Amino acid sequence: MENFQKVEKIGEVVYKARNKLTGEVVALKKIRLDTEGVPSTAIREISLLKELNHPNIVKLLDVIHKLYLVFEFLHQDLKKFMDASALTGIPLPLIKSYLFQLLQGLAFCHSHRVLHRDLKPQNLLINTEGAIKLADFGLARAFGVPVRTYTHEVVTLWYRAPEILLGCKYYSTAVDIWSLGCIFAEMVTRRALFPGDSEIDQLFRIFRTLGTPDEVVWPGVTSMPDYKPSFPKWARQDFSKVVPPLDEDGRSLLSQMLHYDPNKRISAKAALAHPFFQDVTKPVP
Amino acid sequence: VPDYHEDIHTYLREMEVKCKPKVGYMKKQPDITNSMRAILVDWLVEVGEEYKLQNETLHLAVNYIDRFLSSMSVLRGKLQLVGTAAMLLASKFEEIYPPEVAEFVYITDDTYTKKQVLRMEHLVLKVLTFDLAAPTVNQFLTQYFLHQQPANCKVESLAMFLGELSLIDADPYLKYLPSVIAGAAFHLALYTVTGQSWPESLIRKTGYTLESLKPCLMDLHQTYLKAPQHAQQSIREKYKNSKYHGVSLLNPPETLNL
Numbered sequence: 017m018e019n020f021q022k023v024e025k026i027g028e029v030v031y032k033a034r035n036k037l038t039g040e041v042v043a044l045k046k047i048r049l050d051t052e053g054v055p056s057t058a059i060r061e062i063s064l065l066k067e068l069n070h071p072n073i074v075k076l077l078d079v080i081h082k083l084y085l086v087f088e089f090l091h092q093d094l095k096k097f098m099d100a101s102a103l104t105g106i107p108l109p110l111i112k113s114y115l116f117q118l119l120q121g122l123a124f125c126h127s128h129r130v131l132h133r134d135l136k137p138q139n140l141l142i143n144t145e146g147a148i149k150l151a152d153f154g155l156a157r158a159f160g161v162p163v164r165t166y167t168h169e170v171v172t173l174w175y176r177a178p179e180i181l182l183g184c185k186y187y188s189t190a191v192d193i194w195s196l197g198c199i200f201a202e203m204v205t206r207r208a209l210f211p212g213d214s215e216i217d218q219l220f221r222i223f224r225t226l227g228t229p230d231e232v233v234w235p236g237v238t239s240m241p242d243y244k245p246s247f248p249k250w251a252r253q254d255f256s257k258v259v260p261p262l263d264e265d266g267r268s269l270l271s272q273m274l275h276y277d278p279n280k281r282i283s284a285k286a287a288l289a290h291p292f293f294q295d296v297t298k299p300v301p
Numbered sequence: 302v303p304d305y306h307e308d309i310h311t312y313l314r315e316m317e318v319k320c321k322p323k324v325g326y327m328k329k330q331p332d333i334t335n336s337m338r339a340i341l342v343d344w345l346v347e348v349g350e351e352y353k354l355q356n357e358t359l360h361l362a363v364n365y366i367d368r369f370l371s372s373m374s375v376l377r378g379k380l381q382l383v384g385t386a387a388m389l390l391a392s393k394f395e396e397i398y399p400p401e402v403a404e405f406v407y408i409t410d411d412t413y414t415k416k417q418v419l420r421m422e423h424l425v426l427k428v429l430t431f432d433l434a435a436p437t438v439n440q441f442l443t444q445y446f447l448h449q450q451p452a453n454c455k456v457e458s459l460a461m462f463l464g465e466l467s468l469i470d471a472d473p474y475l476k477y478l479p480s481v482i483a484g485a486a487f488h489l490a491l492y493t494v495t496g497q498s499w500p501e502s503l504i505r506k507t508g509y510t511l512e513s514l515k516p517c518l519m520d521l522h523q524t525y526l527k528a529p530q531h532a533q534q535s536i537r538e539k540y541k542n543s544k545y546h547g548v549s550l551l552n553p554p555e556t557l558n559l
């Protein structure tokens with residue numbers, strides 16, 4: 017640690033720091049070890065990031081025993097970029113670039129049997145050259161083929177998939193795609209698609225936009241542990257009202273990322289092949 | 302089939318070669334033997350039952366132990382401390398609710414302190430360079446189960462039982478990759494319950510023929526035949542439960558007709 021000059025606290029603890037010998041600017045993620053030893057979150061983040069070498073996944077550079085994870089530094093997160101762009105909006109080609117790159121990163125995770133389980137704008141890091149990267153693998157898990165039951169308490173509420181809210185025994189890769197669908201819409205409209213203040217409010221916000229799901233839309237839904245036949249039956253809103261600025265291809269992709277049935281929700285790999293990405297470029301923010 | 306199943310299988314096949322322990326490591330250990338390892342693994346099977354831990358957690362703990370003993374000399378009095386730290390790390394990685402350190406101390410009957418278990422956790426992490434996401438026999442078995450025509454709970458329980466017996470005996474099972482042990486365990490379980498063989502869909506997925514699995518199959522058939530005589534019995538006791546369709550009570554086939 018003697019070789020690092022802390023510059024400032026950037027998250028919570030994550031510090032911006034400088035290697036005093038090489039000049040390299042890094043992010044130091046400090047994990048406190050005080051009565052259970054190394055936290056499971058640290059064990060999973062380190063072990064999984066060592067297998068996740070990809071241009072759209074944040075680089076882990078070193079681990080030091082306290083426990084400090086040394087990462088590459090990126091200038092901003094997508095949440096702050098979104099806030100700064102609330103009046104202008106993010107240009108359409110940059111929304112498309114960012115989603116294309118998030119899907120490349122996520123397809124790599126899923127192909128390496130990793131679920132992220134906390135995709136939200138503050139965990140998506142951007143550099144001055146137009147790259148965006150998945151970060152914070154503290155909630156991630158190595159999944160099996162096929163899955164078994166995993167932790168129920170997963171994904172930040174606004175980005176949480178309906179199969180988690182309704183208590184399905186099994187969830188998998190589709191929960192990450194749900195979160196990215198939400199993030200896509202949020203980049204387009206400049207606000208959170210489903211800003212719930214409780215699990216029931218979150219579900220009803222989803223139902224009010226996409227329609228209350230039924231046995232035709234989502235076979236099994238009326239049998240799910242937290243499904244209630246008393247739920248209001250809302251009709252589905254037209255995507256021309258949900259995401260007004262979005263073209264036919266954009267609407268087609270978003271609708272496939274927000275399919276109720278996790279078995280029909282588009283995969284990261286299939287999303288990359290969607291006609292929405294035919295003209296993708298890499299603009300600089 | 303999800304469009305990442307093939308990618309995951311290809312990746313696990315690369316990683317099982319990289320996560321493999323050193324086949325001859327026990328000959329270079331001055332103080333411990335295959336028999337003391339068998340005793341430790343059989344004990345971890347019992348710890349897993351007591352804490353209702355996943356089979357995967359047990360398989361990971363054994364991978365971590367064999368990799369640690371591949372580069373670190375350990376005296377017999379400390380082998381249980383390595384095993385306990387391995388099971389704690391496997392639990393933190395794989396389990397929704399890992400047992401607390403004080404429970405791992407209790408299950409050693411205070412042979413070691415909390416401080417010792419936590420220091421050994423740090424050392425295991427250092428020696429394994431935090432590379433905990435190892436492929437297991439279990440991870441290959443659950444993929445192979447998707448190729449059943451049709452799915453048979455007894456075949457699945459018996460293949461798991463057989464894959465678990467392989468963990469106990471470093472000689473001969475350290476000679477084989479997890480994918481190959483799982484292939485033999487699956488064929489032997491299928492043949493025992495239904496008289497069916499290693500299916501064409503798995504020949505295509507794995508590139509393994511029944512012929513390529515033969516050396517491992519012959520070993521696993523002997524292990525199966527001799528299981529009621531083995532000094533270690535925790536796996537047989539476990540797979541008598543209705544949870545596992547009492548498959549450890551079934552008669553092994555006399556021949557495989559290979």
Ligand SMILES: NCCSc1nc(NCc2ccc(-n3cccn3)cc2)c2[nH]nc(C3CCC3)c2n1
Pocket residue numbers: 024025026027028030032043044045074087088089090091092093138139141151152
């Ligand atoms: N959730 C965002 C905060 S955590 C974060 N932020 C990063 N960069 C964005 C950022 C930079 C400076 C500031 N800032 C300056 C003055 C005050 N704040 C705030 C945000 C990171 N780059 N690389 C990382 C590694 C992945 C784990 C650590 C990392 N983490």
